[PDB]
């Protein structure tokens, strides 16, 4: 019960092939969620190179709605994985607590779940055992997918375990006897999650288990009048028992109900002495390789937008002056152009001291404020 600098505590929940416990940092008190995978229960090959492949693969799936994995600690008896902790509990417990949800919150959870499944599909991994007991809520009422590929060990060995272990959440293809369960199981599970977020109950529920398999194989489900008919077309296009007509991520992204309230960050791509001191190379002014009659016009166009008051003495000597908004006094400086060579010209700044007035604020910091607004507009 001690990994890294984390002690363990009680048991958060149970999984299909994983025991989820709560870990606590002994100094900071931050809550982590460890996931135990017994090697005695399921282990294809016990070679340490596969553990190296886990360390290389599983950590790099960083997404703001996927639970990030921190490290995979090896053990002769088990495998520990330190996922992050969320204090809002499972989605199924939230549905059993609050019943039917509002449509504007169900779409907000559904977009985040679909953007967590689409990130996994872009990174070539599926979550075949997806259910409202495997998606969590945080404190900020978001949606978090618990295990992206950890369910795959259940699927890899035998499909019969997937049907027997999870009779409710199982695709018609899988119970019909298809070998490999692809992303159509992800779309079907996200449709069951959407029906749970819109109606509260489960669409395929029976007491007798072969009748439950027959109900999953049948493409009919209950529909109340509490939900609008604009989303029941999406549910019928998403919960097809035949995968040729089942919806894709693009077929949800072109639907009308999905595009109503959509945040832009869901989809990454729019198309489908003791201390060390490092020396710094400072410059003098602004090095512009243009014509000298145009640089003064560029400076004038820059300082005209900032509402300054300036006069000239030479054609390249400009004594500018601005009045501060909150501070009653005014600040003055002087720009001058220099010819270091025939190609480039340097714009050099010079300050002048206030002679008689005890001005408040600061002199040189307002001098740098007369320049930090000019460098940005000139951008040279």
């Amino acid at each position, epitope marked *: 019960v001690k990994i890294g600098h984390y002690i363990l505590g009680d048991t958060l929940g149970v999984g299909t092939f994983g025991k989820v416990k709560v870990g606590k940092h002994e100094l900071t008190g931050h809550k982590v969620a460890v996931k135990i995978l017994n090697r005695q229960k399921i282990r*294809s*090959l016990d070679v340490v*190179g*596969k553990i190296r*492949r*886990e360390i290389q*693969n*599983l950590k790099l799936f960083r997404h703001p709605h996927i639970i990030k994995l921190y490290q995979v600690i090896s053990t002769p008896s088990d495998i520990f994985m330190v996922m992050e902790y969320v204090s809002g509990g499972e989605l199924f417990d939230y549905i059993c607590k609050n019943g039917r949800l509002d449509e504007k919150e169900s779409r907000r959870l559904f977009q985040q779940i679909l953007s967590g499944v689409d990130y996994c*599909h*872009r990174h*070539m*991994v*599926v979550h075949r055992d997806l259910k409202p007991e495997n998606v969590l809520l945080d404190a900020h009422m978001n949606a978090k997918i618990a295990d992206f*590929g*950890l369910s*795959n*060990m259940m*699927s*890899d060995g035998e499909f019969l375990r997937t049907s027997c272990g999870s009779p409710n959440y199982a695709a018609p293809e899988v119970i*019909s006897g*298809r*070998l*490999y369960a*692809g*992303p*159509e199981v992800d779309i079907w599970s996200s449709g069951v999650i959407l029906y749970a977020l819109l109606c509260g109950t489960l669409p395929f529920d029976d007491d007798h288990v072969p009748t439950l398999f027959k109900k999953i194989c049948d493409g009919i489900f209950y529909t109340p009048q509490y939900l609008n008919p604009s989303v029941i077309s999406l549910l019928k296009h998403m919960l097809q028992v035949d*995968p*040729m007509k*089942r919806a*894709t*991520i*693009k*077929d949800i992204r072109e639907h009308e109900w999905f595009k109503q309230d959509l945040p832009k960050y869901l989809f990454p791509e729019d*198309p*489908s002495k003791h201390q060390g001191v490092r020396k710094a190379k400072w410059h003098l002014g602004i090095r512009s390789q243009s014509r000298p009659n145009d640089i003064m016009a560029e400076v004038c166009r820059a300082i005209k937008q900032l509402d300054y008051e300036w006069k000239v003495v030479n054609p390249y000597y400009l004594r500018v002056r601005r009045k501060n908004p909150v501070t009653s006094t005014y600040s003055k400086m002087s720009l001058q152009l220099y010819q270091v060579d025939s190609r480039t010209y340097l714009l050099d700044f010079r300050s002048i001291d206030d002679e008689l007035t005890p001005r408040p604020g600061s002199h040189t910091i307002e001098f740098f404020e007369m320049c930090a607004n000019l460098i940005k507009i000139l951008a040279q």
Partner: antibody, heavy 126, light 106 residues
Framework: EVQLVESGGGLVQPGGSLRLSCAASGFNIYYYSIHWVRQAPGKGLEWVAS????????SYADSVKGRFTISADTSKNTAYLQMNSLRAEDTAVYYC???????????????????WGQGTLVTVSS | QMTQSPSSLSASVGDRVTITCRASQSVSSAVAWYQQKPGKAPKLLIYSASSLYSGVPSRFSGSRSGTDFTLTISSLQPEDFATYYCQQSSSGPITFGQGTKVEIKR
């Protein structure tokens, strides 16, 4: 229940454009990349074309680069290999096959071709 | 962009054969093996050169040694007499092997 029925094959004149399809029945074409292969009589397999509809990225062999425009229609679950400017050497039986790019296991990025069609025989002769 | 080169052999029923596949460039563990009966469709045997595809039983086995992918057929049944194909898939273009045929000893 996956069957990949090819169509549009037969016999063509050299210098004529052909478009053979692959009716993907039993799965969805938008996720999996339909790959075409070439099986010359007596020789081995040879990969020719690829289209991946999920990211919208295609692939091509070096010998058929820029001459065989592959297309995929997600509404009818077909894959259109529109061949153009074919040579006399391109005379083979063309199998259709789906391609599984996903992690079936934690350690193995599966990258093989699971389900294969019967393949139609195109014959090019003057 | 690369090429493949298997061997060619022939053995008896129940013999343990092996087929190498020397990859040209440096590839990952993304090499498959396709059994094609004459006048049939190429059946998949082992997808990542080390783990068995579901379906066909455990007689077919594969090992990986750098860039020399192997296909070993222990206890050769009288139904497994067909042409076997190496297949590189890690890079952009896909290049098949030359294809080894397995003939019965006579």
């Amino acid at each position: 229940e996956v069957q990949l029925v090819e169509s549009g094959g037969g016999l063509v004149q050299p210098g004529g454009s052909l478009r053979l399809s692959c009716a993907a029945s039993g799965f969805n074409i938008y996720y999996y990349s339909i790959h075409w292969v070439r099986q010359a009589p007596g020789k081995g397999l040879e990969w020719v074309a690829s289209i991946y509809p999920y990211s919208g990225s295609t692939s091509y062999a070096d010998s058929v680069k820029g001459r065989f425009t592959i297309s995929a229609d997600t509404s009818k679950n077909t894959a259109y290999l529109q061949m153009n400017s074919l040579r006399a050497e391109d005379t083979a039986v063309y199998y259709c096959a789906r391609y599984y790019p996903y992690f079936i296991s934690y350690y193995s990025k599966m990258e093989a071709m699971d389900y294969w069609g019967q393949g139609t025989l195109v014959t090019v002769s003057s | 962009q690369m090429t493949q080169s298997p061997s060619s052999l022939s053995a008896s029923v129940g013999d343990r054969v092996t087929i190498t596949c020397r990859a040209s460039q440096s590839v990952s563990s993304a090499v498959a093996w396709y059994q094609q009966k004459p006048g049939k469709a190429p059946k998949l045997l082992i997808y990542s050169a080390s783990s068995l595809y579901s379906g066909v039983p455990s007689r077919f086995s594969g090992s990986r040694s750098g860039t020399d992918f192997t296909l070993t057929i222990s206890s050769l049944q009288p139904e497994d007499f067909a042409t076997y194909y190496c297949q590189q898939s890690s890079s952009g273009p896909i290049t098949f092997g030359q294809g080894t045929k397995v003939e019965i000893k006579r």
